[PDB]
Structure formats: C-alpha cells, structure tokens
Amino acid sequence: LPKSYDYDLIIIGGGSGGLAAAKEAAQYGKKVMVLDFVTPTPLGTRWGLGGTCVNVGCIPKKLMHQAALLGQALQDSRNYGWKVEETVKHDWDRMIEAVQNHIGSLNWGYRVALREKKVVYENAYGQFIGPHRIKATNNKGKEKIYSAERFLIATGERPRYLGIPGDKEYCISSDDLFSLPYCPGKTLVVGASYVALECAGFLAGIGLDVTVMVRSILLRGFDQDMANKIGEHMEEHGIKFIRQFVPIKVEQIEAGTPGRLRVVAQSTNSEEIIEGEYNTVMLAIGRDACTRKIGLETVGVKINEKTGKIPVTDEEQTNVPYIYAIGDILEDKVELTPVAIQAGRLLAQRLYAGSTVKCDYENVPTTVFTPLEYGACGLSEEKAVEKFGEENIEVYHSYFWPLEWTIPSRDNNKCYAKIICNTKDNERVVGFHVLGPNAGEVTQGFAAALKCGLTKKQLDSTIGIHPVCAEVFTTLSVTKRSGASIL
C-alpha cells in the first residue's frame, strides 16, 4: 500500500548517466538498484561495468589520441635537442594492453563505488514487463523480477551498421577497435562522424595506412568551415579520403589476424562503382538508441519510433510519470558523458532532495579529438546567421601558431580561432570555435564565460596569458565582413 516495492529506484544501464544517478541517489538514503548488461558485438567483444565512455568511448579514444600525439612529440624533440632516431616503431599490442589495463582498473572502481554506496548491482539485462515491474535476465538465462517506485532509463546506444553484405561478419566498429587483438593494418574507416575522424586520426598517428570513405560532408551538425579545416589538416597529414561513396559489399579475400577484405563501393551521384583491398574496415556511421528491446510498451513509455529517441520533459520525465530517462537516448539533447552525468545527478537531487535545478542543455561545450583538436561552444557560424540574420552577425577570426611548433618548424598557420557575435545584442559571443592543440582545455573556461553573457567588449577587456594559445581570443580584431586577410 505505502511503497512496498522492492526498490525506491531502478536504473536500467550502468553507464555515465546511470552510475551518476545511482550514486547521487544512494547518498540521500534511497534503496537503489543498477542493472547493467553488455550485449556482445557481432564478433563477440564485451566489456565491464562503466558505459560507452569508459570501455569503448572517451577514455580509450583519448588515450590512443595521446599515443599519437606522443609520436609527434618524439619527432618534435629532435630540434629541441633530444637525441632520438628519425623513425621510432610503435607496438599495437603493447598499447592496447595498457589501455585495457586502465579500463579494467575503472571497471573495478565503479563496482567498488557501488558496493561502498550501498547500491545493488546486478549484471543483467533489463526489460519492463508491466507497471512498476521489470524483468532482469542474467548472463546464464536466469531471470528475476523486481518492482520499484520509479525507474530511470539510461541505456545509451550502440554502433549502427549498414544493411549490407559482409559487414556484421567482417567489419569492426568503435566497440571492437579499442580491444583489437592484432594490429589493424591497412585500415578503411567508413563515415565522417566525430568518431570516424578521431579514430582515423589516431590510427594514422600511430603509423597505419588509413583511408576514410565519406558519404557527403564531414561532421554534419558541426560548423562547416571548421570541419572542412579539420578535413584539410587530416588530408595534409597522411589520412586519405574517398569522397561521396558508400560501400555496398565487403568480402573476405582471406581470413587472418588481420586478414584481407575487399570493399566494393558505389558513388552517391554517379553509377560509378569502385573496389579496394584493406586489412580492416571500421564502420563509424552512426549509433542506435537502445530503446527498442526493453519492453517500453508494457509500461506505456512513448518513444519516437522513427529515431529511437525517448521524448522527455525538461526534468527528464517521460510520458509515464514514475519513469525517467537520461543520456544519449534522449531526444534533442546533447549526446555527451558530462551531460549524461549532470542530468543523472541533478535529477536525483530534484527527486530525493528538493532541488529545483534543471539540467541546462544550452551551449554545452564539446571537443573533437582529431589529430588537430577542435573545441567548441555555442552556435556554429551557419546556425548563428540563420537564427539572428546574416546582417546581425559579426565574425571575428584569426590564424595562430603555437610557440611550441616553431622550433620543430612545422604547421604554421593551421590553427584557427573564431568567435561569432550578435550585433543586435551588444555583440554577445554566441559561438566559440578553436582548432588547435589542447582545444578542450582552451574551451572549457570560455564555456563558463558564455554562461555569463560574455560580450565582445568584455572579452576585449580581458588580458591574455603570454605565451599560450588561448590568448589569441583576447585580441581578435579582424572581422570576416571586413575582408582583411588573417593568413
């Protein structure tokens, strides 16, 4: 009668948002349970507690990015006086081992964090079966049913495939790459998402022959001027591109570790068809919300059956009152770990602690870890013009050259900076974009500045820090309208 459900809250999904909400909730003394299960990849790769970010996302992605940056660091050191050979060899295996070992340490940590906070953790797949009731199936098949006063859906997504011959059977994806047991060799990454380019990037940085087949534009959604510059930088530094082509079939010329596959691709506007041979073929074309097979119908949760995303209120509530959702699965939000975490944390506070602070998904900063990092926050130049009108938007930009690059004598005028201003609003800074080293580190603070209503005037009154990249933003004086060169 008065709440005798099994738990005050059940969380489907032990990833970024999941674990965040779990911990926050436990802190206010609620009986919480977290179900987390990892469904193997078509090739049978699986991993521990943590979510996408910990095992197959940010964490390992960044670390390999770093291995690539360090190779560059080995070359840069020659001119600064370190006596190193001109060509240093890299060991895939040694790397993966190290990365997987860190991951393992994180898996275990999350497990312990849960135990310590008195949160029950079942490594089982969940699916609702009826109001306030869920079924959990473990790895052996054994099932059990639990009731709970509320539910949080934090299930995340997974690498999408092409419906084409040979993919699930021969191709790998983000899920497999970070634990690959052999050097991928001549690789072909397919798609032009953040993931696509980031991986093509580190793969090239560690010495492999890489090619990237794109269907249309690079980084759809991101500022196109910037994207194109990332493209250009990648192309100038190894990575080869095949533009306007989608593959139609992949066939195994020979199994191995790695083997040899042949990819047959077709033009997206010609009847032209090509074919090439590669050791590995990574599919990085998009990801699919894990919202379909969890029996949402039995409980009444309305999801956009088209996209897979779960519409939700500004408080992360679904149509069904006692069921909430956060994370990648949300519809029209931001598909990033910190967001998932913020939502999870604040939601729990809103329920179990009287907080009334809603997660703010506006001008969420982001960074794409391509060989030349790109950081960003706010409107792209396109989306800015559209929203306020070409006439009311001023664009201040400038190239720049990292002091650290002068001795090695490389890449002058590749790094780029631009802010977007709203003339109708005291030249408010509505867009912040930076292409260059340590882009994430540079962007974080300017994000807190946009949350404060940074004005070009106030920016101009800030003094830069010399000599560091980030200062280029304190002295932007050339506008794009003007016409002046910044080259």
Add this chain to the structure above:
Amino acid sequence: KSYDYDLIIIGGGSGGLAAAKEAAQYGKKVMVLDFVTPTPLGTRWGLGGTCVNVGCIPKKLMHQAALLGQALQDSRNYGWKVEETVKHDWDRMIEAVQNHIGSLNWGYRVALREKKVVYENAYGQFIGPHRIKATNNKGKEKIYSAERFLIATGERPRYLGIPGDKEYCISSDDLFSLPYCPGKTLVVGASYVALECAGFLAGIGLDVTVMVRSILLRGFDQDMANKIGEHMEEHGIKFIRQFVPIKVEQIEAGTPGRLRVVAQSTNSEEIIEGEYNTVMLAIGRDACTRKIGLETVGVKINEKTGKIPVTDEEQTNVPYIYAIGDILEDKVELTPVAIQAGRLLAQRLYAGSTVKCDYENVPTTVFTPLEYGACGLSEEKAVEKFGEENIEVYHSYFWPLEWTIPSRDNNKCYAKIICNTKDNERVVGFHVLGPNAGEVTQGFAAALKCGLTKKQLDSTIGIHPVCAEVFTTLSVTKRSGASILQAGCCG
C-alpha cells in the same frame, strides 16, 4: 609647437612596440628608441624587449624542451619503442631558441619600417622639456623634440651586493644564450623566474639546486606555492631553505668553470658552502627609471622602489609624458598588460577612445614543471578583503587521463576557486596546478570579467575527458572538512 615627432617612445619592448604601432596607424609621426645595455658579462640582444629575448619566449621554449623529455618517457607505455634514457644537447637547443629570437628581432624591425615608424638603436635620456638626447652605440648623439613621450623602459635582473656576483654569476639575461651547458647549477631566489628556470634546467637533465631566503613565490597564493615547491622537490630539484649567499668565488675558470658559493643562514649564525658549475641570480628586477634624466623634465618617481607613479590613463605628473610597462607602480608586470596599455593609450590620444586599461584580475601562469595558472584573489588576500567567514573555498585534486598509462603522479594536480558568500558566491579567485594551466586559465579569466558565480559555474557542463572539467563539478569545500583525494581507482 614645431616638434620633431608627435611621439617619442623610449624602449622598444612589449609596451613600447605596441604603442608605437597603434599610434602609427592613426598617422602620427612616431619614433622608437631602443638600446640594450649589456650584462656584466657582456651579453646583448636585438629589438623586442625582455619577453622576446630574455623572457617569456625563450623561457617557455625551454620549458617545452623539458616537457618533451618527459614526453619521451611517457611514450614507452603508450607503445613507442624509445630508449629508457635519451641524451640532451644544450648547444643544439640554444641555437634553435636563438634562431627563433633572431627571426622575431628581424620581424619587429620590419614591422616598424612597414608602419613608417622611425627606429633608432640608441639609448635615450631626457635633457629638458620636450627634448631628449639619444646616444647610439658608437657614442654619437642627437637631440629630438616631440609633443609627447612614452616611457616604456622595463627593468633588469637585480643583483646581490656581494663579492663575486657580477663577475662570476649569470642571470635571466645570460642564461638564454649561454654558450656552454651550465652543468651542476645553483639558482638563487624563489621568484617565478627562479623556479621556472630551475624547473627546465632540471627537466633537461642537470643537477639543480635552489637557495631560498624565505617563502616561495611571495605574492602568489601560498598554498599553491607550497604545492609547486613540493612538486619540484619530489621531482629532482633540491632546495636549501632560509639561506642567502654571501660570497661567490672562482675555484677555476671554464666553460663552465667551478665556483664555490658561501651562504649564511637567515636566522642562525650558521654558514655553509658548496661547489657548483653555474650560479644563477634570480632574486628580483630593477626598474630602468633612474638613469634617463627624469629630473630634467620633472617626472616624479617613487625614489624608493624605482617605479613611476601614474594615472589611470598612464599619465605621469608631467602632462605630456606617459609611461607603461613593468616600470609602473602597483600595476601588473606582464607582457600582455604592457601591450594592452600601450595600445589603449595610443587610442585614447590619437583616436578619441575613452577605454582605460583594466588591471583587475589579470590572469597569469607560472610555467614551473607542473604549471600553475591563476586569476583574481589568492585565498589569503580573499579572506583578508572579505573576511574568513564570508569566503568559501571549493577544492579538488585531479589526475590527467594522459598520465594514467605512464602511471605517474596521481593526485598532484590541484584546483581551487574562492567564493564570496556575501556576493552570491562570486568567484573571486581561480587557481589551477596542472598541465596546460595557461590554456585552462585564459577562459575562466574572461569569466571573472563577467561576474561568474559558483551557481553559473555549476550550470556549465564540463568537456570530457579534459583536465579543465574539474572546475565544473567542485562540490567539496575547505570549511567542510572532507578529504579530496580524487582518483584512485575510480569515483
């Protein structure tokens, strides 16, 4: 009213060249005098100022060489097949650093020619109202008149009045061009210069020691300072605390030679002595305001400190004479600040701008082995100004993803913001000890210019996985008592 120039600028450094260029842009006739008086050992350098030749630029570049050494070690675990120990070539480094400086020197000259600014490589001194004498290198003098003057003369490495220093010791001015590897070195003092150089020299593979009179980094937050101290000590750099040297003597000339430093305790009658190959003096700097005939024109300066008191518009007591840069009294001794002032000043005069240079919450970064960025009040200064009870301090440790594979330095990086509870917990102080601290600090500075509040900070989302994000989620205050050991195995 028939003067030779609309403006004469003494000093072709950071603020000098900035005002020069800005003024020329509004079509005024401008002249810049820049002369470099050698170091007791006779080192000299081109156009540019302290920062270009013997400051920021070469300082950071070497800091970088030290970081790359660490990058070489870090690369092994990420799979790169590198030796355990790589040797460093001092000569090759300096040649490269000096080559960049050179290109910068030339650059600045061309920038002046192109903007139609007259450059005289001569030392200047006022001789009487609106008139100055310029003495070149050979001795030949000339006199010029101008409707207004800008004093942007900067400072120079200060010495100890003690036996053997000017004769056997090097300073920031010499180090960046040193023609030989300094070998076992002893750095005297604990200024940011002191620590930064001790830092890179150690990072490059040298035996380094640091003799300190009292506290490290006087002026900066002490909790932070101490942490840098501790980090340096734990990573090579040796320290001798509470000791000032009393005499330095050459046990044997050479490249480098061998010197013997004799030092006296600062609270005991104890005296010690050690032998070193080089001895760098980094105890402070002196304002170049004394030998420029300021009396002949009436310019009033603080005769004690050497600094020139000035208005909020950078004006001296003498209306047609202005001053910017390190020289100023109670300002901020940083290149970007000199530049801002110089630029804005020229606009105020020659363009009707009414925008004054804002010296409040100027961000800064001490490039020690573990960088330290900062902006606004220190914790100490915040407490004093608003009262212990009204100050809340949010802090946390953090561990760079980049350092996990090489498995090193867990919980060394540290972050802390100071808030004023009486003012919607405004963020009055921002301090971060970790990699790329300048890059991390720059943006939060623009935030403080906007009145960033802890609430607004909390509403900002972090970028993952990046160091700077630790600031978006500070929940532990110092008052509370909670421990902040953030990162063992997880969270």
